[PDB]
RNA sequence: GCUAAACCUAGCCCCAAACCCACUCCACCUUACUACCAGACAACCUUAGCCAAACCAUUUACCCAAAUAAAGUAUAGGCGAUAGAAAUUGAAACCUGGCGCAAUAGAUAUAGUACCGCAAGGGAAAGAUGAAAAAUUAUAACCAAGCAUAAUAUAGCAAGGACUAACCCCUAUACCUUCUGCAUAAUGAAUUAACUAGAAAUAACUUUGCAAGGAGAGCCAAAGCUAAGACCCCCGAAACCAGACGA
RNA sequence: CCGAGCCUGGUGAUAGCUGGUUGUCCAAGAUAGAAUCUUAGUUCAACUUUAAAUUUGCCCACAGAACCCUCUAAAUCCCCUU
RNA sequence: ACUGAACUCCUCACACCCAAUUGGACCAAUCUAUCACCCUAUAGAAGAACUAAUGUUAGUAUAAGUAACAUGAAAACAUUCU
RNA sequence: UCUCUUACUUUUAACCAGUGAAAUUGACCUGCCCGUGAAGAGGCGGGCAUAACACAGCAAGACGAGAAGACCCUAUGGAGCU
């Protein structure tokens, strides 16, 4: 819901076309009164509690509370059987036939999230036998998320992946107070 | 409203309880879902309390057919040729069985 | 009270109430006393020395002007010599 | 009568897109890349709201402040009078004063 | 318009099917139909305490027509076979009027006994044996 | 919203208002309570026991000077330039129990709190600095990624 | 005074 | 629009067994769009509701109403295509089982009233249905007899049982 | 139109409910029917009698003359031994 | 079984990106759409008012630098409704979308056309087969009000209790609003379909996170801080002002 | 359709005044007054609702609450037990 | 002596009869994420529900087949007549 | 004009044929007397009456239809004039 931004609008009683004057004075005839045309009453009038321009749904979390996700995360898909920690994703041939085989062979599931780093490290074989499937999703150790975990049945990391994981998510505790942005100098902090 | 709606006499199916009582009950079909939330209770009663149901009463046939459906049903069949067919859908596995008790 | 302002749409304060009221930051409000400096002429020096007193306001009063005012005006000020510093926090007070 | 006498057209989702199956990719990027990112600065939409939530009538003045001097002339007109009737009615009607 | 209403002729008929065998354009006309089915409901659920009330006027007027026949009277009857320890109900007494004749004589005959056994009491203040029909039986 | 009046049909009086009764904020005389409020001075307390759990803590370390700065890097005070701080004041909170000896830079300080810390070998020096350099010396880093 | 109230022709196309 | 009435003649029905009655011819005819009111129509199709087909065209001849002469034309179309098409010998032996009136598609004018006001008039129009059985007409109901009444009072005196009770 | 898939499910069902009312098939036997095992039947309907039948007795005396007939009828028209 | 009903897709909306258009020939400022003749005149200017102040009489946000923060602070003001900065801070070059509408909706739009007005000006409605109509075939029916098939039966808010039976028996003063109180002979409503009316802060409460600290700079803090949830309608005057159009 | 034309715009003018304000079910729930260009409205009290903290709340007995003329009534306040 | 409530008892069950106002438990349609796969589930959202505004539009009634409205005469349809 | 009205003609009228509105309408299975009651009842209480259904009249009632009373009052609603 963070990023997420409407774009669904109406017109309201002044912004659509016409209607300036009265019609059928106040008081002469039988009919309800009425001071214009395009009011929400009448058919092509404005709309009155309708959608307004684009609207932003935008809020942060606590980045604390987001790396606890994280690690929640994580331990679910340990606790459920659904990690596998690989040394390197490395493929002989390279093709998706010989992925999705191993994946039903070893009783992953149907989708599988493969972690990586840098996404420049990233092996020829692994990218080419990947960009072709569909349910199995390689992203680089940057692009983890709680949404993808969950949408994947399986997550697949690697050692280094691991590592960094680790350290990144234990770094949220025994935290001082921000005092100023994260991407400034703070010299012990790279 | 009774105005409103048909009515009858109290009445047996055929003198039930003058010689012996005989079960009225002939049949009991289930349609529950392998997958789907709505069938988990009729598919925790079928893992438990209907292989007890059919022991306790014998002159019932009980058929579960396990099909994909998005609400799972039960029809009870009468000697008397009535049908009646009642919705299991979302419910938990004590109600379903006070459903098939009742029924 | 303009409870969103045409340029940043924030609330904004009253200035009569900060003009004429003051906050300890327990939620207090002091004021004075009306009439305390018009015809003293008419009025015993017991009067006049009761019309002379700081006194603390309602709790509807004191609500009121904290809907009245905003927000900076309730932070916890640190003065050098501040009169009413050991005013700004309640003692032996139970529920 | 108002029911449609047919079954519309049975509308297939396919789960698996790349949209979807990227779904999320890359939020947490200043958490677990230094914070040279913040995740808001994935967002894309009009200017004047990228990582700011704002009321309508908020919206309606921010909207006027960063993007009103390249606005159409009605556009603009009708910017004006809306703020004029939100802020008569946020700060003059309704329960709760 | 985002999310209009879809079902609105389920409801129509939710309301509709109690109306049918009205009369009128309130059998079809929903705007009419609502208001007779709202007011028939009410009155479907204030008809219970009637029911409940004629029904015993209906026994009491038979067992009245019954009394009458064997020649006693409604209070008497009623008194009488209290006075003896016998709880029958109007309901069941109506009953036995119209498909016991002989048992139903059998009870005014009883109640005419105690009636004139009470008349002997509050005449000798019992002295000897206060009657037979009388003596209540006691429980503990 | 209940039956007609102003209630239902929400054109209600402005808060404050009473009917047309002189109110109640306006009743009361002026009185200069808040008369210069954003020209006072404002310096955040420090006290002797929260510097010795800061010490104790291996936060802000005794064997170097210790002025603003040390104190916002081991987060014992936050300093706020805007709102009209104008740096630390050391109070005697503590004065007692505490065995410290520091050299300590502060911009105020009670003559309890100065021999407190004198009395344990330390010495205390009460400095000044403006706005300006109070941004400065609070946040240093941002300053010079500023370029001046 | 004299109150009139003019008659209101409907559109020719209905 | 609804053309149903049309299409009732297409029905083709399976041999019948040797042994089974005639299962008399079933000729269904109309005619749309009648510059008529469908009332002024409904009286005549009533009229004419019951009777033969020869009995119906002759009180039909003397009728003096417009809508006489457009039944007149649709019976003799009716009875033409039912000795044709549907396998009816003699011409003379059918009767009317169905004749009724329909609301056809209407237009809309302008009344210019007496003043600025106005009223809108409408352009009616309507159809005609009618249906013709092979055989002699059937005969008409008697009216009950007292017998009948005084059976029927039997019958509601002897019907009732105690209510209310056992 | 109106988005949805609900009310026409709901309103679809009612239609082939309408028809099946106007227009109700001739009726057919239980055995045609899907829930049907013939062994459970007939051990049910021995069951809930409270006796004890011999099974190919009562299969025996279910059978019919006429429906002997008319499945050798059929076989013999089919060619099928 | 008639009238009818039903249908997806013309198009539209909000963003993003990008600065965008206009002589085939002829005619068109006189009475425009007119081939061809002698006084040459010419534009540059502080809006006002409704409304709010519960009246109104000074006053009452609306102006065209990316954000944010300072800050709703300094200040202004029938010192009152309300109005409200700045210094300073710092604002990461590229990606073709939609928890938008789907024929009473979405542009007024099939069109600024028809129609209305002297004029300025106002301003509509609506379409639905199929691969093939160089398939006119037989199917596809089922569904609002209104009618027809098929007028009526002592008595009574139209029903309910019932009952062997539709009625007959018994019980029962339509609904909404407005009121001390309405069957009221007080309001509104022929009826069907569709459309048609609760928008948000301060401060509290609950649920998480972290905790003398919280927060992704700014702010708060003598358990607090951060985040989320939850919350304030619709139609209607007689008016006033500005600029056009009319003898 | 001129006590001051008509059209467009400001304009969704404003209305303490009338009208209207759309699923189900349950629960608690009827108010002493003051001020007000105010009595067709509102603000504060009062009553009512929710959530919390704590301990008393109601009913009440003896004793008790100037006088002054001529009576001085039904009663009231206060109030432990219960 | 009897009749006579929704009072009370009896068999079984119980949250299930006040306006404004307030607290609470559910919930129809739709879209989105993920399920499901003869129409569902867990959540997020919102143009989210109409027996009533002399409401807007469209259809069709009632009044009602009513009020009202037409064409001088004969003929050969050449013509003549009033 | 009237005491004091009558006769005829034309229109209208009524019937037959053709075409074909409008105001109005909560639903109506739409009686009388007395009483009652938001104080003037077809609908409530007590009595009485009472097969069904067109057509032509009439105007006592439906506090009949039309026009959100113009008279009167109110509004910190207007406007013209002095
Ligand atoms: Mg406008
Ligand atoms: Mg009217
Ligand atoms: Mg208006
Ligand atoms: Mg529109
Ligand atoms: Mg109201
Ligand atoms: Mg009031
Ligand atoms: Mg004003
Ligand atoms: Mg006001
Ligand atoms: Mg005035
Ligand atoms: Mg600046
Ligand atoms: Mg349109
Ligand atoms: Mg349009
Ligand atoms: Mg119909
Ligand atoms: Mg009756
Ligand atoms: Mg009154
Ligand atoms: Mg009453
Ligand atoms: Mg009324
Ligand atoms: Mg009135
Ligand atoms: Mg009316
Ligand atoms: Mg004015
Ligand atoms: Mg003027
Ligand atoms: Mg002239
Ligand atoms: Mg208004
Ligand atoms: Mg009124
Ligand atoms: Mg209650
Ligand atoms: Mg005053
Ligand atoms: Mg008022
Ligand atoms: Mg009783
Ligand atoms: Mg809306
Ligand atoms: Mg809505
Ligand atoms: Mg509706
Ligand atoms: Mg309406
Ligand atoms: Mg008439
Ligand atoms: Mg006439
Ligand atoms: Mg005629
Ligand atoms: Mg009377
Ligand atoms: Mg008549
Ligand atoms: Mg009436
Ligand atoms: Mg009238
Ligand atoms: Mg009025
Ligand atoms: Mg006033």
């Known amino acids: 819901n963070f990023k997420r931004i409407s774009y669904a609008k109406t017109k309201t009683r002044a912004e659509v076309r016409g209607g300036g004057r009265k019609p059928w004075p106040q008081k002469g005839t039988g009919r309800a009164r009425h001071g214009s045309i395009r009011s929400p009453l009448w058919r092509g009038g404005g709309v009155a509690h309708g959608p307004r321009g684009p609207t932003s749904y935008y809020y942060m979390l606590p980045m604390k509370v987001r790396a606890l996700g994280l690690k929640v995360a994580l331990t679910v898909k340990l606790a459920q059987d659904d990690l596998h920690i690989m040394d390197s994703l490395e493929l002989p041939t390279g093709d998706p036939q010989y992925l999705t085989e191993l994946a039903h062979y070893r009783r992953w599931g149907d989708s599988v999230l493969l972690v990586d780093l840098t996404h420049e490290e990233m092996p020829q074989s692994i990218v080419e036998a990947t960009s072709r499937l569909k349910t199995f999703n390689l992203i680089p150790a940057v692009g983890l998320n709680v949404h993808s975990m969950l949408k994947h049945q399986t997550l697949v990391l690697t050692l280094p992946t691991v590592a960094f994981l680790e350290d990144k998510l234990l770094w949220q505790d025994s935290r001082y107070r921000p005092l100023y942005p994260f991407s400034l100098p703070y010299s012990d902090f790279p | 409203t009774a105005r409103g709606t048909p009515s009858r006499f109290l009445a047996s199916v055929l003198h039930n309880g003058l010689g012996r009582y005989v079960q009225q009950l002939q049949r009991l079909s289930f349609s529950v879902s392998r997958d789907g939330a709505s069938s988990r209770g009729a598919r925790e009663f079928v893992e438990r309390e209907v292989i007890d149901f059919a022991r306790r009463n014998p002159g019932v046939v009980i058929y579960v057919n396990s099909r994909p459906c998005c609400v799972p049903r039960v029809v009870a069949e009468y000697l008397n040729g009535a049908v009646r067919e009642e919705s299991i859908h979302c419910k938990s596995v004590e109600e379903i069985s006070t459903l098939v008790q009742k029924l | 009270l303009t409870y969103f302002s045409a340029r940043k749409g924030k609330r904004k304060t009253v200035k009569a109430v900060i003009d004429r009221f003051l906050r300890l930051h327990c939620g207090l409000w002091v004021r004075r006393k009306a009439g305390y400096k018009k015809k003293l002429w008419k009025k015993t020096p017991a009067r006049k020395k009761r019309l002379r007193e700081f006194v603390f306001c309602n709790k509807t009063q004191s609500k009121l002007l904290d809907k009245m005012t905003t927000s900076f005006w309730k932070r916890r000020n640190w003065y050098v010599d501040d009169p009413y510093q050991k005013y700004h926090d309640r003692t032996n007070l139970k529920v | 009568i108002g029911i449609r006498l047919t079954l519309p057209p049975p509308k297939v989702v396919d789960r698996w897109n790349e949209k979807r199956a990227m779904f999320g990719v890359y939020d947490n990027i200043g958490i677990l890349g230094n914070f040279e990112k913040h995740p808001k600065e994935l967002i894309r939409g009009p200017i004047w709201l990228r990582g700011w939530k704002g009321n309508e009538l908020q919206r309606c003045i921010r909207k006027r402040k960063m993007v009103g001097s390249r606005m159409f002339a009605d556009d603009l007109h009708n910017l004006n009078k809306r703020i004029r009737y939100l802020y008569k009615h946020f700060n003059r009607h309704g329960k709760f004063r | ?140 | 919203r209940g039956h007609k009046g102003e209630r239902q049909r929400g054109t209600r009086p402005r808060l404050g208002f009473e009917g047309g009764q002189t109110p109640f904020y306006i009743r009361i005389p002026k009185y200069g309570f808040n008369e210069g409020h954003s020209f006072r001075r404002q310096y955040k307390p420090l006290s002797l026991n929260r510097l010795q759990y800061l010490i104790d803590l291996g936060r802000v370390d005794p064997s170097q000077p210790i002025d603003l700065t040390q104190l916002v890097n081991g987060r014992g005070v936050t300093i706020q330039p805007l709102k009209r701080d104008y740096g630390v004041q050391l109070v005697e909170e503590g004065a007692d129990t505490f065995t410290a000896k520091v050299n300590i830079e502060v911009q105020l300080a009670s003559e309890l709190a100065i021999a407190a810390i004198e009395k344990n070998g330390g010495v205390v020096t009460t400095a000044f600095y403006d706005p300006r350099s109070l941004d400065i010396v609070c946040k240093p880093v941002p300053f010079f990624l500023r370029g001046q | 005074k004299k109150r009139f109230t003019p008659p209101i022709y409907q559109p020719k196309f209905k | 629009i609804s053309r149903k009435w049309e299409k009732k003649n297409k029905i083709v029905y399976p041999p019948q067994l040797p042994g089974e009655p005639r299962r008399p011819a079933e000729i269904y005819h109309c005619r749309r769009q009648i510059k008529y009111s469908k009332d002024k129509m409904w009286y005549l199709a009533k009229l004419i509701r019951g009777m033969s087909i020869d009995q119906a065209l002759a009180q039909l001849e003397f009728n003096d109403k417009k809508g006489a002469k457009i039944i007149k034309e649709v019976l003799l179309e009716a009875q033409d295509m039912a000795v044709r098409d549907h396998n009816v010998e003699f011409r003379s032996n059918l009767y009317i089982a169905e004749s009724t009136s329909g609301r056809g598609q209407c237009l809309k004018r302008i009344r210019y009233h007496g003043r600025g006001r106005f009223g809108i008039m409408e352009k009616v129009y309507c159809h005609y249905f009618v249906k013709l059985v092979e055989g002699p007409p059937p005969p008409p109901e008697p009216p009950k007899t007292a017998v009948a009444h005084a059976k029927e009072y039997i019958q509601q005196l002897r019907s009732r049982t105690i209510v209310h009770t056992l | 139109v109106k988005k949805g898939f609900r009310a026409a499910f709901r309103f679809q069902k009612e239609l082939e409910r309408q028809r099946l009312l106007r227009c109700p098939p001739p009726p057919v036997r239980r055995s045609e029917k899907p829930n049907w095992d013939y062994h459970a039947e007939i051990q049910a309907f021995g069951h809930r009698l409270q006796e004890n039948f011999s099974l190919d007795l009562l299969k025996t005396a279910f059978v019919n003359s006429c429906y002997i007939k008319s499945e050798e009828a059929k076989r013999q028209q089919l060619g099928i031994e």
């Open chain 5, 1 to 140: 318009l985002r999310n209009r209403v879809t079902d609105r002729y389920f409801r129509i008929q939710e309301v509709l099917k109690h109306a049918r065998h009205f009369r009128g354009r309130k059998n079809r006309c929903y705007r009419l139909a609502v208001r007779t089915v709202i007011r028939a409901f009410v009155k479907c659920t204030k008809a219970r305490y009637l029911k409940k009330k004629n029904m015993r006027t209906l026994w009491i007027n038979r067992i009245t027509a019954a009394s009458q026949e064997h020649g006693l009277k409604y209070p008497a009857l009623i008194g009488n076979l209290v006075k003896c320890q016998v709880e029958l109900n109007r309901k069941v007494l109506a009953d036995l009027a119209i498909y016991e004749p002989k048992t139903f004589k059998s009870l005014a005959a009883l109640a005419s006994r105690r009636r004139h056994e009470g008349f002997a009491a509050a005449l000798g203040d019992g002295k000897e044996p206060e009657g037979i029909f009388s003596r209540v039986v006691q429980y503990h």
